[PDB]
Design a protein around this ligand. Sequence first.
Ligand code: CDL
Ligand code: CDL
Ligand code: PC1
Ligand code: PC1
Ligand code: PC1
Ligand code: PC1
Ligand code: UQ8
Ligand code: UQ8
Ligand code: HEM
Ligand code: HEM
Lengths: 58, 327, 426, 32, 55, 460
Amino acid sequence: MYLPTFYKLFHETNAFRLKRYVGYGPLLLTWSIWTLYPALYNMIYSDFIPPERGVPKR
Amino acid sequence: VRLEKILWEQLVNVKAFSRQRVIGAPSKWYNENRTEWFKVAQHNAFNTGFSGVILRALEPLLAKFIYRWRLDIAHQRGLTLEDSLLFMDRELRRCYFFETVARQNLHPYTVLFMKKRRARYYKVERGLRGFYVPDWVRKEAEERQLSETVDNIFNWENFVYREYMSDMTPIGRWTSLSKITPLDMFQYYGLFRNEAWDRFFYNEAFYESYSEKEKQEANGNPFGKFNLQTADGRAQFEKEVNTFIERYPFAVTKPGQKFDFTRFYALEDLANKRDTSKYDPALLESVKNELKQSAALPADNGANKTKKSKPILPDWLQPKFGKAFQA
Amino acid sequence: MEWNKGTYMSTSIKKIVQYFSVMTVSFHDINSLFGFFTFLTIASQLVSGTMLAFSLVPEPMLIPMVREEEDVEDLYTDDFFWLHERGVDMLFIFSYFHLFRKIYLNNFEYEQEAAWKSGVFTFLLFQVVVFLGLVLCCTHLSDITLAIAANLYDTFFAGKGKFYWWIFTSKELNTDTIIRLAYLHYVLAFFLAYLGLIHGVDMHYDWKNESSMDGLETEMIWFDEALSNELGAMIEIILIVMIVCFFMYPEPEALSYEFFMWGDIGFINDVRFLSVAPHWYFRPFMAWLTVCPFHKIGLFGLIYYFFILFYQPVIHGTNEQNNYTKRNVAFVSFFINRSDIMTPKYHSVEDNLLHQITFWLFLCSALYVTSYLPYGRFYNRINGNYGTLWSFMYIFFYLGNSFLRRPLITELYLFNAFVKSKFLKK
Amino acid sequence: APVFLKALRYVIYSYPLYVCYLIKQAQINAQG
Amino acid sequence: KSERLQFSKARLTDFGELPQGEIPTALQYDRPCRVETLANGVRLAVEPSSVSPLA
Amino acid sequence: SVRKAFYDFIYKDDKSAETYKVTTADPRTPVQGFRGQTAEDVAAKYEVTKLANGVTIITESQTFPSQVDMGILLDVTRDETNETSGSLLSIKNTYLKTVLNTNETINYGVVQQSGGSFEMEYDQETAYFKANCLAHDATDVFSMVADCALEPRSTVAASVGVEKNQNTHKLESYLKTGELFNESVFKTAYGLKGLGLPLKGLRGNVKNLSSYTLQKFQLENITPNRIFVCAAGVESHQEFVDLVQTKLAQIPSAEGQKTHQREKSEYLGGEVRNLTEESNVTLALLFQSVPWSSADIVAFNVAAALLNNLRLKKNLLQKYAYFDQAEALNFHFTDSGLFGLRTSGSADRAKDILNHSIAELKAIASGVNADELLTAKAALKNSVLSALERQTDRLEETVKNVRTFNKIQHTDYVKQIDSVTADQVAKAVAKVLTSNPTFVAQGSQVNALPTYDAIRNLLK
Ligand SMILES: CCCCCCCCCCCCCCCCCC(=O)OC[C@H](COP(=O)([O-])OCC(O)COP(=O)([O-])OC[C@@H](COC(=O)CCCCCCCCCCCCCCCCC)OC(=O)CCCCCCCCCCCCCCCCC)OC(=O)CCCCCCCCCCCCCCCCC
Ligand SMILES: CCCCCCCCCCCCCCCCCC(=O)OC[C@H](COP(=O)([O-])OCC(O)COP(=O)([O-])OC[C@@H](COC(=O)CCCCCCCCCCCCCCCCC)OC(=O)CCCCCCCCCCCCCCCCC)OC(=O)CCCCCCCCCCCCCCCCC
Ligand SMILES: CCCCCCCCCCCCCCCCCC(=O)OC[C@H](COP(=O)([O-])OCC[N+](C)(C)C)OC(=O)CCCCCCCCCCCCCCCCC
Ligand SMILES: CCCCCCCCCCCCCCCCCC(=O)OC[C@H](COP(=O)([O-])OCC[N+](C)(C)C)OC(=O)CCCCCCCCCCCCCCCCC
Ligand SMILES: CCCCCCCCCCCCCCCCCC(=O)OC[C@H](COP(=O)([O-])OCC[N+](C)(C)C)OC(=O)CCCCCCCCCCCCCCCCC
Ligand SMILES: CCCCCCCCCCCCCCCCCC(=O)OC[C@H](COP(=O)([O-])OCC[N+](C)(C)C)OC(=O)CCCCCCCCCCCCCCCCC
Ligand SMILES: COC1=C(OC)C(=O)C(C/C=C(/C)CC/C=C(/C)CC/C=C(\C)CC/C=C(\C)CC/C=C(\C)CC/C=C(/C)CC/C=C(/C)CCC=C(C)C)=C(C)C1=O
Ligand SMILES: COC1=C(OC)C(=O)C(C/C=C(\C)CC/C=C(\C)CC/C=C(/C)CC/C=C(\C)CC/C=C(/C)CC/C=C(\C)CC/C=C(\C)CCC=C(C)C)=C(C)C1=O
Ligand code: HEM
Ligand code: HEM
C-alpha cells in the first residue's frame, strides 16, 4: 500500500504551487519591460555594449 | 513531481550503493523512545572508547560545576534537582502540551506542590532580595535523594512517550503565527529536517538504530565491568562507588553517612537468578519488604473524609412560616 | 487569505483602553524593564523629532545654516536636538540591553515566538530609521553613510542599471535625496510606535522577569503600581548615565569622534579620509567592513547577523516536536555512534554554568567589537587585532549554532548521574 | 542522516574558518 | 498461483503499490459469462455462480 | 521519460502513448493487448484449529478469488459492571486508536490506502472487529486489526472515547432512537445487572471511562480462550495460521488461572410506564423465549418473520390508521432470550393499540396456516441467504456459530427452516406466552392503561 509521509505531500503540493506562480513571473517581467523601456535601453546600452571611445573633430 | 523517483533518488538510492528505499510493515512516527536513546548514548559516550576515557577524566570538573552547583542553588532556594528537572520551569509556567497532558493524566497536587515550593521562596525573594532559605526548610529539601527523582523523571518521560509522543504524526507546515510580517509569513517547516527526508513513507524500514548488543550493554553496571562474585571485583566496585558518593553528596546517601554494600549485593542476588544464604534472614526479609514498598503505587484509603456541602436557599428567599387553610 | 488565521489582539481604542486598564504585571526587577525604557525613549524621540521637523528645511545647502541660526533666534530648539541625539543613544543602549537580557533567559521557545520575532522586526525597523536620520545631518559623516548604504544597495544588482536611483539619487545627498529620506524617516519613525505597541501586546502572553518559575499568582496592576516603578527605574538609569557621561567625557576633549562631523556637504569638498568614524552604535558594522575587506562577504555578514538574530526561536526552539527533533552533528556522531542527536532538554538559566559562560563570552565579544575602530588605513598591512576577529567569529557562532546553546554535554552528564544513582538504589 | 543536510551542517561549521583564512591571506598580501 | 504465499508483497514493486499497468492477482480472473441474441432481439446473458446460494 | 515529462508539463495528450490508448478505448470493445483468464468457483471448506495458548482460528478457502476478509471475535456488554459500563462503546468510538506499534493516523491511512474497510461492532455478549482488503495488503491489515482488538486502551484513547460517548448519548436522546427504548426494555427484563446493562452504557458513568477502567475491563474479560480469529478468501489455512501465530501467540494462556466467568442470567417480568407528553405512544411486550442451544431458535425466527412480513402489516398497520409502526423483536443469548412485539401508534386510544398487539401475538399461539407458514419460510430463506451470499456476513456468522457451537450450522439453515412446522411454532409461542410479561410503555397517556395483572389475564 502507498502511505506517503505528509511531509512529502506538503512538499509536492508547494512545488506544484511554485510552478504555477512562476508562470506569472514572465508576465510581470513583460509588464515592467513594456513600462520603463527607456530605463531598459539605458541599462542595456550603458553597462552592456559600452559606447565606443571617440570624439568628433569639431 | 514525486520526491521519490526524482533524478537524485534514481541515481543514488540504488541497490548498487545499498541506498535503496526498503518498504516494510507500517510503523508509528517517533519509533524510538527519547529516554532510552539518551541512556544508550550516555553509556556509549562515557563508558566506551576515547570519548569515554576523556569524559571519565572530567568527572571531577563536571560534578563540581554541573551537579553540585545546581544542588547548591536549589538548596539555597529550598528546592531539589527534581523541582528543576522533573518538570522544567518552562513547562510549569507556559507550555500547552504539558498543560494538556497534566490535565488529562495528572492529579492536581503533582504540580501544585511544585508551584507552591517555589512560591515559598519567591514570596520573600521578590519582597526582599538575597533570601537564603532557613535550615528547617533546607532539611526537608535535603531529605529526598536523587534516586527517587530519577525514578520520577524516567516514569514521566516514558509515560509521555508511550501515551502522547507515540501517537503524533508531524506534517509539512507553514508559519504557526498568523503574522503579517513577511519574514514570518514565508517560514517553511518540513524541509531541512533529517526525519522528513530519511523516510518518505510510513511503511519504510528504519535505517539507523541502536544494535541490540549496545542496548543490552547499556543496562549493565554503570560504574564499569566488574565481577561482584570475586573479591577483587567487589573491592574495585566499592572504591568506585565510594568516590562517586563523595563527588555527589545527595545522590544515594546523606553527605555524612556511608553506603551499605551488603544490602546492595543482597538486592542484586535476589533480582537475578544467583542465590545463596550468605545473608542473614533478617536482611533478606528487609530487602524484600523494601523492594515491595518501592514498587507499590500509593492508593487511597477512603478514610478521614470531610463533609460535602448541600447548600439551601436562605430564609429571606423562602416563604414565611405560617400556612393556613387556603379556603 | 485563508492561511492567515487572525490577529492576537484587535488594536482598537476601546479594546486597547480596556486592556491597559485591566492589565496585570508580576513582580519584577530593573533588568526586566529595558523594554519600557525603549518605548519611552521612542515616545520622546517622536516628540523631539516632530519639534525638529518644523525647523529643518530639506535643502542640503541650508540645513547647517538653518540649524545654527535657529538655535539662537528660537529657544529650546537646540535643547530638542540634544534630546533627540541622546534619545537615539539611550534607545540603542536600552534596545541592546533588552536583547541581551532576552537572549540570557533562553526565550527561543515556541511560546515566545510571537513575542520574540515581533520584537526583532521592530528592532530591525529601528535600525533603518536611524540610518535615515544620520543622512539628515548633511555632514561628511552623512555623506560617507549614504555612500556606503548606496554601495550596499547596488551590491545586490551587480552594479547594473542604477536601481538605487529612486532613493539614493546619484548616491549623493542633494535636494531630492534629502527630501525623500527625511519624509521616509518621519513616516517610519511614527510606524515604529505602532510596531512597538504590537510587540508589547504580543509579549505579555508569557512574560517573566526571571527564568525560574515563581509560584506567585498575585500581580501588580499596571497603570500606576507598575508604571511608577518603570518611571523610577528610568530615572535611576538616567542618573547613572549622567554621572558616567559627566566623568568619562571632560568638558573640553581632544580627538573626539565628532571631529569627522566638521565637514558640511557642499561647503567643504575635500574629505579627511584619515579619520572616518561613525557613531558608536554603527561602529561595529564599519569595523566589520574594515576587518572583512571583501565586499560581498561583508554584506553577507551584516545580513546574516540581522536575520539570524530574527530567526532565533526556530533554530534553538522546541520546534513543536517536544525536543524530539534531531540535530546534525559533525564529530559527536563518532563518539555516540549515531548519525543524529536528540535535542537536549535540561537547559535552565540560573542553575547551569555553561550557558552563563557562553552568554557572557558573547556579550563581551559584542562589547569588544563596539570598543574601537579598526582604523583600516593599515589595519591589514599590520596584522589586525586578533581580538576583533575572535569576537566577530564568536558572535557568528553563538547566533546560529546550537552546540553553544542547549549543549548536549549537560543532558548526557545528568543522564549518567541518573543511571548511576538508580543502579545504586535500584 | 541525509547527505545534503550533513553537508549543510559542515558548511555552517566551516565557513567562518574559511573567512578567517581569507582574511589572513589578505593581510599577508597587504604586507607585500 | 504466483507463488506459495497468497499474502506475498513481491509484486508491489512501486513503493508498496503495484506499478501503473499491473493489477491484483484476484482481479486477473473472470467468471464465465455467455451472451446470446434471439430472433425477437431479446438478449440473454448468464454469469453462473455455482457456489452461490441464490439465483 | 523525456516525452512523458514534456507532455505532462503542457497539459496535452500523448497519442502515441500506450497508456493513453488503453485509457481511451471504445467501451464497446475489449482492450487491445490485455485479457484475463477465466476461472470457476470452488466449494467452501471450513477449518478450525486451536493454538497452544487457547486462541482458536477459523478459516474458509476461497470459493472464487476475491478480496480477503479477516476478523477477530471476542466473547467480551453483559460482562461489564456498573463501574466499567459503556467501555465497549468507548472502544467502538475509538477502535482505530492504538499507540504501541502503529498510530491512529497510520492505522486510518492503512485502511484508506488499502481500498478495503475496517469496522467494529458489539452486542450484549460479543465484540467483532472485521477488515476486508486485498491479498497483498493482508498482513498489514491483519496486524492493524490485531493491535486494535487486543492492545490495551491508552489515556488519549480514553479521553477521545469519553468525548465521543457523550456526543453519542446526546444524539441518542435527541433522536429518541429505538435503541434508547430497547435499553429500558432490557433493564426491565433483567434488571440493572447482566443483560439489562445498556449497550451504550450508563450515562452517569461516562466520565469514569478512563484508561484504568478500560484496561481493568479488558484484563478481566479479554483472555486467550475467549478470542476467535477468522479469515475468508484464504488459499491455504496454514499461511493464515502462521500469520496469526506471529501476532497472537505471545498472549500467555489463561487456563488454570482465575477467570471472571459469567453469572447465570435471571429473568424478571417488570413493567415501565413513562409519561413524556408525546403525541405518539410506543409499547413493547416481550417474553423469555429460548437460548441458542435450544432447537426452537429456528421456530422463533420463523415466527418473527411471519409476524413482520405477513401478519403485522396486514392485520395491524393496513387495517388501522393509528398504527404508526409495528415490528417483532427476537433476541437470543447463550442462556436467555426475548421474543415479543414493539408497536408505536397514536397516543390517544393506546388501549386499543395494546389490545390489538396482544391479540396479534396470541394469534400465532392459536395456530398458523400452511400458506402463511410457507410464505414466512420463503421470506426467511431469502433474507438469510442474501446475508450468507456476501462473504463478510457469511464469515461473521461462521465465527458466531463456531463460538456458540463447535460446528458450523450456517451451511444448512435451509434444512432447519424447512423442518419447521406450524404446530411447533404455535406450541413454542403458546409456551412462551405463559411466562411473566415484560411490558414497557412510553407516551402521553401511558397512565391510562391496564394494570400488569390485567395484561397477564389478557395474555392468559
Ligand atoms: C504618520 C503620517 C503618515 C500616515 C500614513 C497612513 C497610511 C496612508 C496610506 C493608507 C491610507 C488608508 C488607511 C486604511 C487603514 C485600514 C486598516 C487599518 O486601519 O487596520 C489597522 C491597522 C492594523 O491592521 P491589522 O489587521 O491589525 O494588521 C497588523 C497586525 O497587528 C499584525 O501584526 P504583525 O506583527 O503580524 O505585522 C507587523 C507589520 C509588518 O508589516 C510590514 O512589514 C509591511 C510594511 C507596512 C505596510 C506598508 C504599506 C505600504 C503602502 C504604500 C503607499 C504609498 C503611497 C500611496 C497611498 C495610496 C494608495 C496607493 O504589519 C503591519 O504593520 C501591517 C499593518 C499595515 C498598516 C497600514 C495600512 C494602510 C496601508 C495599506 C495599503 C494602502 C491602502 C489604501 C486604501 C485606500 C485607497 C487609497 O493599523 C494601522 O493601520 C496602523 C497605522 C499606523 C500609522 C503610523 C504610520 C505608518 C503608515 C503606514 C506604513 C508606512 C510604511 C512606510 C512606507 C514606505 C513606502 C515607500
Ligand atoms: C481646538 C481645541 C480642541 C480641544 C482641545 C482640548 C482637548 C481636551 C481633551 C480632554 C480629554 C479628557 C480625558 C478624560 C480622562 C482624564 C483622566 C481622568 O479621568 O481624570 C480624572 C482625574 C481625577 O483625579 P484623581 O482622582 O487623582 O485620578 C487620577 C487618575 O488619572 C484617575 O485614573 P484611574 O486611576 O481611575 O484610571 C485611569 C485609567 C486606567 O489606566 C489606563 O488604562 C490608562 C490608559 C491606558 C491606554 C493609554 C496609554 C497611555 C496613557 C494615556 C496618555 C497619557 C499622555 C497623553 C499625552 C498627550 C499629548 C501631550 O482608567 C481610565 O480612566 C480609563 C479611560 C482612560 C481615558 C481614555 C478614555 C476617555 C478619554 C478619551 C475618550 C475618546 C478616545 C480617545 C481619542 C479621542 C479623539 C477625539 O483628574 C485628574 O487627576 C486630572 C489631573 C490634571 C492635572 C495634572 C496634569 C497636568 C499636566 C502637567 C504638564 C504640563 C501641562 C499643564 C496643563 C496645561 C493645560 C492643559
Ligand atoms: C511630555 C511628557 C514627558 C515625556 C517624557 C519623555 C522621557 C524620555 C526619556 C529618554 C530621554 C533621553 C535622553 C537622556 C539623556 C541622559 C543624560 C545624557 O545623555 O547625558 C547628559 C550629559 C552628557 O551629555 P553630552 O551631550 O555632554 O554627551 C557627550 C557626547 N557623547 C555622549 C556622544 C560623547 O551628562 C551630564 O553632564 C549630566 C550630569 C552633570 C553633572 C551632575 C552629576 C554629578 C555626579 C557626581 C557628583 C559627585 C559629588 C560628590 C562630592 C559632593 C560634595 C558636596
Ligand atoms: C529596508 C527598507 C525598508 C523600508 C522601505 C521599504 C521598501 C519596499 C520595497 C520598495 C521597492 C521599490 C522599487 C522601485 C524601483 C523604481 C526604479 C526602477 O525600477 O529602476 C529605475 C532605473 C531607471 O534608470 P535610469 O537610467 O532611467 O535612471 C535615471 C538616470 N538619469 C537621471 C541620469 C537619466 O531602472 C533601471 O535603470 C533598470 C531598468 C530595469 C528594466 C526591467 C524591469 C525590472 C523590474 C522593475 C520593477 C519595478 C517595480 C516598481 C513598483 C514596485 C512596487 C512595490
Ligand atoms: C556582521 C557583523 C556586524 C556587527 C554585529 C556585531 C554585534 C554588535 C552588537 C552591539 C552591542 C552594543 C552594546 C553596547 C552596550 C554599551 C553601550 C555603551 O556603554 O556605550 C558605548 C560605549 C561608549 O563609546 P564612546 O565612543 O562614547 O566612547 C568610547 C571611546 N573609545 C571608543 C575611544 C574607547 O562604547 C565603549 O567604548 C564600550 C566599551 C568600553 C570598554 C572599556 C572598559 C575598560 C578597559 C580598561 C583596559 C585595561 C586598563 C587596566 C589594565 C591593567 C589592569 C588589568
Ligand atoms: C551559485 C551556485 C550556488 C550553489 C549552491 C549549492 C549549495 C550546496 C549545499 C546545500 C544544498 C541544499 C541543501 C538542502 C537539500 C534538501 C534537503 C536534503 O538534505 O535532501 C536530501 C535528499 C535525500 O537525501 P538522502 O538520499 O541522503 O536520503 C535517503 C537516505 N536513505 C536512503 C538512507 C534513507 O536528496 C534530495 O532529493 C535532494 C537533492 C539535492 C537538492 C538541492 C536543491 C537546492 C540546491 C541547488 C539549487 C540550485 C542551484 C543552481 C546553481 C546554478 C549555477 C549556474
Ligand atoms: C509585561 O507587561 C507589560 C505590558 O503589557 C503589554 C506593557 O504594556 C508594558 C509597556 C507597553 C506599552 C505599549 C505601554 C508603554 C507605557 C507607557 C507609560 C506609555 C508611554 C507613552 C507615553 C507616555 C505617551 C502616550 C502618547 C500617546 C497615547 C499619543 C500617541 C501619539 C499620537 C496619537 C500621535 C502623535 C502625533 C504627533 C505629531 C507627535 C508629536 C506630539 C506631541 C504631543 C508634540 C507636538 C504637538 C503638536 C500639537 C505640534 C510594560 C512595560 C509591561 O511590563
Ligand atoms: C519611496 O518614496 C517614498 C518616500 O520617500 C522615500 C516617502 O517618504 C513616502 C511617505 C511620505 C510622504 C508621502 C510624506 C509625508 C510626510 C510626513 C508625514 C512628515 C510630517 C509628519 C508630521 C508628524 C507632521 C506634524 C505636523 C504638525 C503637528 C503641524 C501642526 C499644524 C497645524 C495647523 C495644526 C492645527 C490645525 C489643524 C489640525 C487643522 C484643523 C482646522 C483648522 C485649524 C481651521 C483653521 C481655520 C479657520 C477658519 C478656523 C512614500 C509613500 C514613498 O513612496
Ligand atoms: C524612534 C524614532 C526616531 C529615531 C530612532 C530617529 C533617529 C534619528 C537619528 C539617529 C538622527 C541623527 C542624529 C545624529 O546624527 O546625531 C535623527 C535626526 C533627525 N530626525 Fe529623527 N529619529 C526618530 C524620530 C523622528 C521623527 C518622528 C522625526 C520628525 C517627525 C524626526 C526628525 C529628525 C530630524 C529633522 C533630524 C535632523 C535634525 C537636524 O539635523 O538638525 N526624527 N533622527
Ligand atoms: C525598539 C525595540 C523594542 C521595544 C520598543 C520593545 C518593547 C518591549 C517591552 C515594553 C517589553 C515588556 C517589558 C520587558 O519585557 O522588559 C518587551 C518584552 C519583550 N521583548 Fe521587546 N522591545 C524591543 C526590542 C526587542 C528585541 C530586539 C527583542 C529580541 C530580539 C525583543 C523581544 C522581547 C521579548 C521576548 C519580550 C518578552 C520577555 C518575556 O516574555 O519575559 N524585543 N519588549
